[PDB]
């Protein structure tokens, strides 16, 4: 292929697998299946892939969570491939590795954290319900856009104090960063967030509000005031991650659901396992993988690493690796440990992961108990994309409303 760059000097013959982080040859068998061929019998810990301009990736829990661990060989300073957009990647704290990162993540966490959602508790409840009932009469639905994208969404807009109206824009935006169609390299989606951000940076700093922009653009980090330009680079994470992380989940997780009766009626029996049922969703259909770079040349299980190489250290794989779980395609809501890395691991582990859990929950619950029987539109066959974090394209749905019920 011309999408194969030159292999390096330094990277074996025997290592390289070149697997397309962006389209995955498997990709038809599902998104998790088609990351999991890095993980079938003949492949190592450790392969070089000539897409996507060229780089590592560590296939194995093991590993991923060795390197996230080491941030002094493996810099989150360039974390995503292709190395442009790696580059031009610098949103707070997440482009920034410790001891610099942390002022900033304290910031963050406070934003985003466990209090905020609890206050945000019967909020994402009623949204949650007020979807759901208008669609339970209906018997069908585009899931993606229907549920999986207005719900997590409106929510963290809610949280951000943003209009509405600005979703298809920023939404639009933040997918080029993810799963680019090829309209916008990341620096220009990159700069068209921060666009957006600057006048209402510059607005909430002169009559600051009580919405997570406010709280960033007047915060501090250890004791000092943050500028106009720390607050864009950290509004603008906050945005990719209420918009394209929960969003894709919730679709994989329902996706799943409308093809398994029997899961379905297991939590409708006895949905005190619903919470059990969220952390091995999260495992089974984990959806994220960005990465690092060498801050210089390190010997890594074996492998010569170079300064400057690029590292894929897929969050996804930790938990579909069998030497982490049994029968890692197997959905088991009984699962005795659920082991991932499914937000990260090490000093960036993910700070939405709680209101992330939270929009999850409250899903499963309220869906289940107004829509307990659905499934796939007949004959539709449902297409994942692969990217910094995977998805469904289009998950329509059906049933019969006389099996659904008002509550
Ligand atoms: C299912 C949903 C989610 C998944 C799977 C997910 C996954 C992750 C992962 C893998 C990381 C670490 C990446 C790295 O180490 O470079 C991370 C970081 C982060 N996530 Fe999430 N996330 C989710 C939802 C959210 C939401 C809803 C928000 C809220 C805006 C959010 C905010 C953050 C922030 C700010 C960080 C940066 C932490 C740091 O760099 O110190 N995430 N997330
Ligand atoms: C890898 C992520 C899921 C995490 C939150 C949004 C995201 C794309 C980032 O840039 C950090
Ligand atoms: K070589
Ligand atoms: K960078």
Redesign the pocket.
Known sequence: NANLAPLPPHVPEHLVFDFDMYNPSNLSAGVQEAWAVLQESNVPDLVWTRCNGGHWIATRGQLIREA?EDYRHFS?EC?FIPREAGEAYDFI??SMDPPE?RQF?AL?NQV?GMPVVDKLENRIQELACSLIESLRPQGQCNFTEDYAEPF?IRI?MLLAGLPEEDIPHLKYLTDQMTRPDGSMTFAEAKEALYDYLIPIIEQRRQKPGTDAISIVANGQVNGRPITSDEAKRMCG??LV??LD??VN?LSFSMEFLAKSPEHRQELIERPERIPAACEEL?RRF???A?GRILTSDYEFHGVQLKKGDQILLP?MLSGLDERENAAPMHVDFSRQKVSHT????????????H??RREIIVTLKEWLTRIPDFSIAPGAQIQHKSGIVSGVQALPLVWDPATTKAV
């Open positions: 996230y989150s974390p704290p997440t990162q993540r963050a985003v997590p963290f994470l906050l991650g209420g992380t929960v989940f999260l984990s959806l994220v960005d969050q499914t937000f990260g691991h090490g000093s960036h582990l993910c700070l939405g992961q209101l992330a």
